Amino acid sequence: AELKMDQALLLIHNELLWTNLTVYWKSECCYHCLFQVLVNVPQSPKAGKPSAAAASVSTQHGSILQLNDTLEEKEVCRLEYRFGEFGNYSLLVKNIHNGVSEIACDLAVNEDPVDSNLPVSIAFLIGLAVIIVISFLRLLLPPRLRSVDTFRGIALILMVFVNYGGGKYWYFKHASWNGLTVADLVFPWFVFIMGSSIFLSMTSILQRGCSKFRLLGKIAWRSFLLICIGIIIVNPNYCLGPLSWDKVRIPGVLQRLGVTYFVVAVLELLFAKPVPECLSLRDITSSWPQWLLILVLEGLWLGLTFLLPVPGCPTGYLGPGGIGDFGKYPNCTGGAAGYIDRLLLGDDHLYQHPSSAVLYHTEVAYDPEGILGTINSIVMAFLGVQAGKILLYYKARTKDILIRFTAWCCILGLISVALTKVSENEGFIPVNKNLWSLSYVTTLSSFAFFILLVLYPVVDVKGLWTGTPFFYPGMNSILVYVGHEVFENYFPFQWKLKDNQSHKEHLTQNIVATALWVLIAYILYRKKIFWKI
């Protein structure tokens, strides 16, 4: 068996004679949430014959159990415990007779749980062993930037692993409302890299002599293709049935990239300047028209998020709704960000399975790729432009590039510390992928500037590493992204599992499927088949 993944068996024995017990369950990860009923345990009919009730408790995080007298609505005892996967626990509720009439509840482990993260530890050990063997085996025996392809390839490899299931591990899934996991990293990085490629390609194109009007037509064609491919190809689940307009999801990943690419590229094209040939600020001062408009857009996001009144909803609400925030705003998932989507697009055209629907039991439709959060996608893509400006403005001096990448990583990291208050749920603006919050952008941009700080001198300047095998997917990013959406259910990326409730079998299937997309992109590289939108 009755146990599923990340579940343990809990047996409650009620030795009390005149007390009915209701067991409530709360997860320690669920912030300011309500207790949910777990199981009702009746009173013991006779002394020495305890009443037994069974329940399944989630073991992904810590569990908080509250046992309340049903008749008197009074708390009997409170229990905090972290259960283990496929464990068998017994909770005995008996009244101690050592001079008092109090009730003491204790928990016993009938059968020990299993190590849930053992496959992940073994997979990391196996992967590290392969790298060492390959490294030791060989010891005995305008140009395209390789570090940008390597950094894009890393995000593509992480994308396929987590989109295909991630081993069904909670830290390889999206966070419910607040915080960061491994799955919440790749999308901002793709926006960061896309902005860098905007400046790198535009500078070379305009240098050779292409006109701005002809380049404006190329920007609009690429944006149109990205939006159309997302709505028609990527978004729908055609296994359910033929497409109907009433159930078409308008927002999405490629629609966000298409709108973000258009705004940033047009902004860069409109105020484009030639790149001139230590203490200089010429990559920032020369682009002050963009910066002034970017901070005006950022003020609009802050103004609508914290000041726009949402009917039947608090102003500036940043919680998930549902049973969160003590269940006072069940239909307020997203605050003003979700209100704008429901008002402009309607619930039928939004994303129907938000990540908060499991931990906070939200009922309304929220789209993480909403309208309001597109402002912060432009901010993230404009920080990629700054990364591409440092590379080209100071190409001659490697030390100049490294100094600028360190200053931006440190400054953007300091803003995140003040905004998040180094906390998951506290702070002025908590990190939130669903809202695409400001501290989400500054945190992931700080990571992106640090990755370039390490990848650029290792891969591009010194050449100690060629980026293998990451740069092969990085040169066919659209083929890999569109490919794994179309062929998600196909063999050999997916096959029937002997045990659907096993972390080991899910992880092995997802690792093999990810390694096949790296191999597919390697064959395309060897055959010189590259597709660009």
Ligand X SMILES: CC(C)CCC[C@@H](C)[C@H]1CC[C@H]2[C@@H]3CC=C4C[C@@H](O)CC[C@]4(C)[C@H]3CC[C@]12C
Ligand Y SMILES: CCCCCCCCCCCCCC
Ligand Z SMILES: *[C@@H]1O[C@H](CO)[C@@H](O[C@@H]2O[C@H](CO)[C@@H](O)[C@H](O)[C@H]2NC(C)=O)[C@H](O)[C@H]1NC(C)=O
Ligand U SMILES: CC(=O)N[C@H]1[C@H](Oc2ccc3c(c2)O[C@@H](O)C[C@H]3C)O[C@H](CO)[C@@H](O)[C@@H]1O
Catalytic residue among 97, 174, 349, 506: 174
Torsion 280-283-288-291 (CA) sign? negative
Would you say 227 and 259 are in contact if contact means Cβ atoms under 8 Å apart?
Answer: yes
User: Does 44 interact with ligand Z (rule: CB under 6 A)?
Assistant: no
Checking phi first, is residue 242 left (phi over 0); if not, alpha (psi -120 to 50) or beta?
beta
Q: What are phi and psi of 404, to 5 degrees?
A: -70, -40
Per CB under 6 A, the list member of 40, 110, 211, 466 interacting with ligand Z is: 110
Residue nearer to ligand ACO on the CB measure, 50 or 188: 188
- Which tokens hold the place of 508? 């092995």
User: Does 441 interact with ligand Y (rule: CB under 6 A)?
Assistant: no
Site string for ligand D12, 384-423 (x = CB under 6 A): ---------------x--xx--x-----------------
Rounded Cα gap, residues 313 and 333, in angstroms: 10
The residue assigned the tokens 């010429």 is 282
User: Does 238 interact with ligand D12 (rule: CB under 6 A)?
Assistant: no
Shortest Cβ distance from residue 418 to ligand X (Å)?
21
Identify the bridge partners of residue 111 per DSSP, sorted by sequence position.
88
User: Does 246 interact with ligand Z (rule: CB under 6 A)?
Assistant: no
Q: Which does 490 bind (CB under 5 to 8 A by kind): a second copy, ligand OCT, ligand NAG, none?
A: a second copy
User: Does 66 interact with ligand Z (rule: CB under 6 A)?
Assistant: yes
Q: Are strands 88-95 and 103-111 parallel, antiparallel or unpaired?
A: antiparallel
Q: Kindly state the DSSP code that residue 155 receives in the 8-state scheme.
A: H
User: Does 245 interact with ligand D12 (rule: CB under 6 A)?
Assistant: yes
Q: What are phi and psi of 332, to 5 degrees?
A: -100, 35
Shortest Cβ distance from residue 357 to ligand ACO (Å)?
19
Residue nearer to ligand ACO on the CB measure, 195 or 324: 195
Shortest Cβ distance from residue 316 to ligand OCT (Å)?
7
Q: Which does 497 bind (CB under 5 to 8 A by kind): a second copy, ligand OCT, ligand X, none?
A: a second copy
Q: Give, in order, the Cα–Cα distances in Å from 339 to each of 127, 320, 349, 375, 510.
A: 45, 13, 13, 16, 36
Site string for ligand Y, 222-251 (x = CB under 6 A): -xx--------x------------------
Is the omega angle on the peptide bond into residue 492 within 30 degrees of 0, that is, cis? yes
Per CB under 6 A, the list member of 93, 105, 253, 448 interacting with ligand ACO is: 253
User: Does 242 interact with a second copy (rule: CB under 8 A)?
Assistant: yes
Residue nearer to ligand OCT on the CB measure, 16 or 336: 336
Cβ burial 259-272 (10 Å sphere, 16+ → b, else e):
bbbbbbbebbbeee
Per CB under 6 A, the list member of 43, 51, 56, 494 interacting with ligand NAG is: 43
CA 168 to chain centre: 14
174 catalytically annotated = yes
Q: What are phi and psi of 228, to 5 degrees?
A: -65, -40
How big is the chain by its Cα radius of gyration, in Å? 27
Site string for ligand Y, 151-190 (x = CB under 6 A): ----------------------------xx----------
Residue nearer to ligand Y on the CB measure, 44 or 476: 476
What is the three-class DSSP state of 430? coil
Other CB atoms within 10 A of residue 300 CB: 12
User: Does 25 interact with ligand Z (rule: CB under 6 A)?
Assistant: no
- Give me the count of residues in the chain: 533
Burial of 523 (0-12, 13-18, 19+ CB in 10 A): exposed
Residue type at position 488 = E
User: Does 3 interact with ligand X (rule: CB under 6 A)?
Assistant: no
Angle (CA) 486 491 493, round 5°: 70
Angle (CA) 413 416 422, round 5°: 110
The enclosing H or E element of 455 equals helix 438-455
Identify the bridge partners of residue 36 per DSSP, sorted by sequence position.
25
The closest alpha carbon to 479, from 174, 160, 120, belongs to 160
Stretch 304-363 residues interacting with ligand X (CB under 6 A):
304, 307-309
User: Does 267 interact with ligand Y (rule: CB under 6 A)?
Assistant: no
User: Does 502 interact with ligand NAG (rule: CB under 6 A)?
Assistant: no
Shortest Cβ distance from residue 496 to a second copy (Å)?
4
Note the residues at the interface with ligand Z (CB under 6 A).
9, 24, 35, 66, 68, 73-75, 88, 90, 110-111
Query: Which residues belong to the active site?
Result: 174
* Residues making contact with a second copy (CB under 8 A): 232-233, 236, 238-239, 241-244, 486, 489-492, 494-497
Which positions touch ligand ACO (CB under 6 A)?
Answer: 144-145, 148-149, 152, 159, 186-187, 190, 193-194, 197, 200-201, 205, 253, 257, 477-478, 481, 532-533
List of residues contacting ligand Y (CB under 6 A): 179-180, 211-214, 216-217, 220-221, 223-224, 233, 258-259, 262, 266, 269-270, 340, 371-372, 374-375, 398-399, 402, 409, 413, 416-417, 420, 422, 424, 431, 443, 446-447, 450, 453-454, 457, 461, 479, 483, 487, 490, 520, 531
